[PDB]
Amino acid sequence: VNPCCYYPCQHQGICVRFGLDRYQCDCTRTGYSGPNCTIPEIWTWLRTTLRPSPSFIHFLLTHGRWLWDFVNATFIRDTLMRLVLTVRSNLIPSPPTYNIAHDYISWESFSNVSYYTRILPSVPRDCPTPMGTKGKKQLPDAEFLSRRFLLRRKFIPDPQGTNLMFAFFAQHFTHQFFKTSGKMGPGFTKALGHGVDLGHIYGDNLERQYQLRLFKDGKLKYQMLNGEVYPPSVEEAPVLMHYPRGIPPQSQMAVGQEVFGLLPGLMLYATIWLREHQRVCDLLKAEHPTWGDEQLFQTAKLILIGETIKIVIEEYVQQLSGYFLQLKFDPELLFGAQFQYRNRIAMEFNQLYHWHPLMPDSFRVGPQDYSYEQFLFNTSMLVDYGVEALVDAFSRQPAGRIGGGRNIDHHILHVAVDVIKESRVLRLQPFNEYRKRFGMKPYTSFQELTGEKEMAAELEELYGDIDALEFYPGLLLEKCHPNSIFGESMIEMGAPFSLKGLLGNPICSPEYWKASTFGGEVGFNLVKTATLKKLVCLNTKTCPYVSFHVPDPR
Amino acid sequence: VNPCCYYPCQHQGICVRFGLDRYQCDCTRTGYSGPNCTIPEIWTWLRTTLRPSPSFIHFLLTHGRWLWDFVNATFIRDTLMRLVLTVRSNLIPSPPTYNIAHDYISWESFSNVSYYTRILPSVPRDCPTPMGTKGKKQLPDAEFLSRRFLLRRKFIPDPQGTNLMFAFFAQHFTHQFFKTSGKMGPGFTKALGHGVDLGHIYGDNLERQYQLRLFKDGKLKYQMLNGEVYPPSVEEAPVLMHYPRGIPPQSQMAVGQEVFGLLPGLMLYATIWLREHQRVCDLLKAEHPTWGDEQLFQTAKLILIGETIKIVIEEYVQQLSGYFLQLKFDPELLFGAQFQYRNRIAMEFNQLYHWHPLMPDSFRVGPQDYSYEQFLFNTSMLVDYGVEALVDAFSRQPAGRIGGGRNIDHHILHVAVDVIKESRVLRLQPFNEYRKRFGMKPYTSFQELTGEKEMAAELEELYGDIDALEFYPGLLLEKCHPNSIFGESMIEMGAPFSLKGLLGNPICSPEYWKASTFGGEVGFNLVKTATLKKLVCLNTKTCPYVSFHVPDPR
Ligand code: HEM
Ligand code: HEM
Structure with missing residues (x-):
């Protein structure tokens, strides 16, 4: 009973219960x-029938680098880049649609921005199975699936050669828009602003942003330890910070995102970006002696947002896609498109970025391995090694494979368990429904999903139907592409959520992406040539190896 | 000193101080x-040189009704309507640009939505004149300009034949997005949501929206006086309401916009729309017995927003434009355009809608005139005459001319005085700067402005330079078009602010304007055929004369 439990409306039509x-x-x-x-319109039809296989398109982007050096040297770079942008971005609705409270469009869902859109509605709470129609009457014990299938047995490094500089960049970056409320529940972001508002550096709320500001030359507060510039102490900026009970204000560093006390990883980066903010303030001060603090501050936030979003497209996404196409951040590719410039980060996008398999077994900085119980919460490590050293270290240690399964190190395995349980509170639809939704074809068997027989078989025994595989488990347990960090679904579902959040940033709008926004060519060129190496090395007394890539292929 | 005081950058280029x-x-x-x-690009040039005079285009829209009956009967209705939409909407920036705190783009200006964008920055606080360069060293005494020029000497009715049904519709409507904070100051809207969120019916804050809701069938709370449905008392919904001290809860009606106790005018309409909400709830309940309260409520808010925005385009704006073009609300005209669906109501748009000249000398309901001191705050009048009667009355009494000057009745003349002083706090740029900005040509003399010699001459004596005429004074004192309620600037500056707010409503987006949003054809057709007569007459026991127009031409 309740027709919409059968997920009747194909091609994202919407099932209104009459x-x-x-x-x-x-x-x-x-x-x-x-x-x-x-029933397809003849155009609809023809398009879909001619659309090449995803798995195939992937191989073309990892076919002969010669041809791609040539394509990258022509304007086709720009054409394909525009086309990636348009095509991938069209899959995400704008304005936002639903949220945990509403599986219909409502004005509230449209305006209560503490919410996270979901792109597919809940499994209706009156369905026979908790997954709609098909599946076992009661889902697999989360605790169990995670220990049995997600848990790291033996460390599998990522084949693409991703390192921890990337692992931690991704952590930092992601934590400016994923901030589940906790005190309100699932659904509910505390990171209102919903994208690359750099609130991990500056604060999710103004009051804290003022607490971290120096209010001189547009600068951010800081402290000076040994030779360098490190974030201020909670002593000098009250702000808050989550630190294990019994750690003292003085030894705590005040940062923007309250969680970043948790690891050096998070702290390292927040130091680089604070140093980068200051730097930019001074160039801008030099240019415009009139400016005054607020305008220097705000113009700096704009440059650094421009930087962050360039580095993400041309270096971070270029590292994990592994395409030989040279990706480019040129907002102007979209000025001819029908693109809406706004973003609402989706709860599903939060599940998908739960990619904790990157974290390794131990952290080798210098020639000494550190345990998680030495790494997590270590307050001195940053100050002790200094930005230069840690960058080099993290740049050399490899990060784990994401996709494929059996790779979440036990220390953090509990998190994946909580994720599956949140999928459940959230009542997220099946995996495959999301597969269809993202333009893919559903798996007919777990054997098709995984790509082997042993896990698939037990998985089948547990879930009961391939059409009842939970979204996050399926995402992590799917077969990796050739020799890639994850497989098909991570790219086809993740990629649109990511490119809309990036290019749907107001800065990319024709209205804003003008040189004056950034304070004239000076500022504007800083966002236009931003590079990870430049970010780290211009703020460090000596340039280490800085890369998202593990060296030389070693 | 300070180059930007000379307003150097033409065609809305931006003056960055180096x-x-x-x-x-x-x-x-x-x-x-x-x-x-x-220096114009050849295209830029050619366009501008071929663009016909505004004053002329106006006459074409009020040239032979025969030709316009034919054009209205063809698809050209739709073409010109699309074109009005695109062309007029392009003049308003999206995303928003500035605000009182920032005369540059900043992320804050972009996200602190308690703010009101201005489309032109402040007169820099370091300029020689308070208006930049030109003008008297110190502006005209507001008190004086208003008594001398704005004040009603003898009542001039509006020639277009606007009535008080329109005067009050406009008041009600406008007060859902203009809600200056007071406690924070100028700048600062309390009506976050910035457009046709129907927060005048439902509340600017959720907590109040829950206070006005019945939480049964999606309905809104109410009370039953004599035969009819009237808003609940502050007794039954705490909510707040501004009422003159000493009026008791019971006698106060609880509504949505806290000010509406002020006049029957405001209350009359809020009664019609509450009755309309209930009605829609029931049709929807009848359609979907499954639905439950929240979804009936939210789907009703969507229908009524659709209604409000249709009635405004096809009837309200058609009444005050006076064009023979039949305007239409069809969101689909914009699905081929590059349109952004978001709005931020501008402080200038608030000044321009300060059009208090509509209010008459006394209020004749029935055959008895009421004084302002009988009308304002009269708590019984609504209940005493009932919606039916008052609609008829207000539908017959004519509203005053807006433009032209010397027409603000003394009882409310003080408001215009506060407006001019807010223009001043706001540091709004000259009038003409805004003229240029909205694609018009600046006045060379007050004589050109006004269109007579006596006021112009004194005005000149007061302001010192035509290039120093304040925005609101100039708006109200400019010569009315032929036999129209206001003149050129009100239409060329007002019209884009208005059409972006209307069509930039999420409901009009391809993502939302689907039948399901409204709950199937039933709901969707209610927004698609909404009519002022239907609004009033389907919620009244007997249909009066209902129009924005004064009858028959009498
Ligand atoms: C490889 C880098 C990592 C990425 C990309 C990553 C990503 C995420 C994301 C997206 C969230 C959701 C945030 C929210 O919505 O509130 C999260 C939560 C969490 N992560 Fe990570 N994480 C990473 C590394 C780590 C590490 C090293 C630890 C171990 C200290 C960790 C522990 C947690 C915990 C405890 C939570 C919050 C609690 C929960 O979800 O039940 N993460 N992580
Ligand atoms: C013809 C209909 C009217 C229109 C279109 C109109 C429009 C406006 C607008 C746009 C505001 C600004 C609201 C804000 O931002 O807070 C306003 C303020 C005000 N109006 Fe009206 N109004 C009308 C009739 C009236 C009447 C009849 C009165 C007399 C009781 C009145 C008295 C005021 C007052 C006292 C203020 C607020 C104080 C101030 O601005 O200093 N208005 N009106």
């Missing part, structure tokens, strides 16, 4: 027609 | 080039 026993699919401009939105 | 003594104009994609953004 009088009691019946329902209706709204196929408004889905490209399909008829009662379950399934 | 090292001390010098500055630079950023002409990024203005269509013009060179140091003050003045």
Whole structure:
């Protein structure tokens, strides 16, 4: 009973439940027609039938680097880059649609921005299985799936050669828009602003942003330890910070994102970006002696946002895609498109970025391995080695494979367990529903999913139906592409959430991406040539190896 | 000293002050080039030179109704309507640009949404005149300009034949997005949501919205006086309401916008829309017996927003434009355009909608005139005459001319005085700067402005330079078009602020304007055929004369 439990409306048509026993699919401009939105318009049809396999497109982006050096040297770089942007971005709705409270559009869902859109509604709470129709009557014990399948047995490094500089960049970056409320529950972001507002550096709330500001030359407060510039102490900026009970204000560093006390990893980066902010303030001060503090501050936040979003497209995403296409951040590729410039980070996007397999077994800085119980919460390590050293270290140690399964180190394995349970509170739909939704074809067996027989078989025994595989488990347990860090679904589902958040940033709008926004060519060129090496090395007394890539191929 | 005081950058290029003594104009994609953004690209040029006079275009929209009956019967209705939408909407920046605190783009200006964008920055606080360069060293005494020029001498009715149903619709409507904070100051809207969020019916803050809700069938609370449905008392919904000290809870009606106790006018309408909400709830309940309260509520807010925004385009704006073009609200005209769906109501747009000249000398309901001291705060009048009667009355009494000057009745003349003083705190730029900005040509004399010699001459004596006429005074004192309620500037500056707020509503987005949003065809057709007569008459026991127009031409 309840027709919408059968997920009847295909090609993202919407199932509105009508009088009691019946329902209706709204196929408004889905490209399909008829009662379950399934008969293709001739165009719709032709497009889909000619669309090449995802797994195949991947290989073309990792086919002969010669041809791609040539394509990268022509304007086709720009064409394909525009096209990646448009095509991938169209899959994410704008304005936002639903949230935990509403599986319909409402104005509230549209304005209460403490919320996280979901792109697919809840499994209706009146369905037979907790997953709709198919599946076991009661889901697998989370604790169990994680120990049995997610847990690191033997460390598998990522084949693409990702290092911890990347692992930690990703952590830092992600934690400016993923900040689940806790005190309100799942759904609910405390990181309102919903994207690359650099609130991990400056604060999710103004009051804290003023607490971290110097209010001189547009600068941010800091402290000076040994030779260098390190974040101020909670002594000099009250701000808050989560630190294990019994750690003292003085020894705590005040940062922006309250969690970053947790590891050096997080702290390292927040130091680089504070140093970078100061630097930019001074160039801007030099340029405009009139400016005054507030304008220097705000213009600096804009440059650094421009920097962050360039480094992410041209270096971070270029590292984990592994495409030979040279990606580029040129906002102007979208000025001819019908693109909306706004973003709402989705709860599903939060599940998908739960990629803790990157974290290794121990942390080798210098020639000494550190345990997690030495690394996590170590307050001195940063100050002791200094930004230069740690960058080099993290740049050399490899990060783990994400996809494939059996790779979450036990110290953090509990997190993946909480993720699966949140999928459950969240009532996230099946995996495959999301597969369909992101333009992919559903798995017919776990054997197709995994790509082996042993796990697949037990997984089958547990879930009961491939059509009942939970979203996060399936994401992590799917077969990796060739010799890649994850497989098909991570890229096809993750990529649109990521490119809309990046290019849907107001800065990229024709209205804002003008040189004056940044304070004239000076500022504007700083965002236009930002580079990870430049970020680290211009703020360090000596340049280490800095890369998202593990060296030389060693 | 301070180059930007001379307003150097033409065609809305932006004057960034550089090292001390010098500055630079950023002409990024203005269509013009060179140091003050003045040399036209050949396209830019050709367009502008071929653009017909505004005053002329107006006459074409009030040229032979025969030709316009034919154009209205073809698809050209839709073409011109699309074109009005695109063309007018392009003049308003999206995302928002500045605010009182920032005359540069900043992320804060972009996210602290208690703010009101201004489309042109402040007169820099270091300029010689308070208006930049030109003008008297100290501005005209507000008190004086208003008594001398704004004040109603003899009532001039509006020639277009606008009535008080319109006067009060406009008041009600406007007060859902103009809610200056007071406790924070000028700048600062308490009506966050910035547009047609129907927060005048439902509340600017959720907590109050829950206080006004019944939480049964999606309905809103109410009370039953004599035969009809009237808003609940502050007794039954705490909510707040501004009522003159000493009025008791029971006699106060609880509404949504706290000010609406002030007049029957405001209350009358809030009664119609509460009755309309309930009605819609029931149709929706009838359609979907499954639905439950929250979804009925939210789907009703969406229908009523759709209604409000139709009635405004096809009836309200059609009444005060007086064009023979039949305007239409069809969101689909913009699905091919590059339109951004977001709005931020501007402080200037608040000044311009300060059009208090509509209010008459006394209020004749029935055959008895009421004084302002009988009308304002009269708690019984609504209940005493009932919605039916008052609609008829207000539908017959004519509203005053807006433009032209000398028409603000003394009882409310003080308001216009506060407006001019807020223009001053706000440091709003000259009038003409805004003229240029909205694609018009500046006045060379007050004589050109006004269109007579006596006021113009004294005005000149007071302001010192035509290029120093304050924005609101100039708006109200400019010569009315032919036999129209206001003149050129009110339409050319007001119209874009208005059409972006209307069509930049999320509901109009391709993502939302689907039948399901509204709950299937039923709901969707209610927004698609909404009419003022339907609004009033389907919620009243007997249909009066209902119009924005004064009858028959009498
Ligand atoms: C490889 C880098 C990492 C990435 C990309 C990553 C990503 C994430 C993300 C996206 C969240 C969700 C945040 C929210 O919405 O509130 C999260 C939560 C969490 N992560 Fe990580 N993380 C990483 C490394 C770590 C490490 C090293 C630890 C170990 C200290 C860790 C422990 C946790 C915990 C405890 C939570 C919050 C509690 C919970 O979800 O139940 N993460 N992580
Ligand atoms: C013809 C209909 C009217 C329109 C279109 C109109 C419009 C406005 C607007 C746009 C505001 C600004 C609201 C804000 O930002 O806070 C306002 C303020 C005000 N109006 Fe009206 N109004 C109308 C009739 C009236 C009447 C009849 C009165 C007399 C009781 C009145 C008295 C005021 C007062 C006292 C203020 C607030 C104080 C101030 O601005 O100093 N208005 N009006």
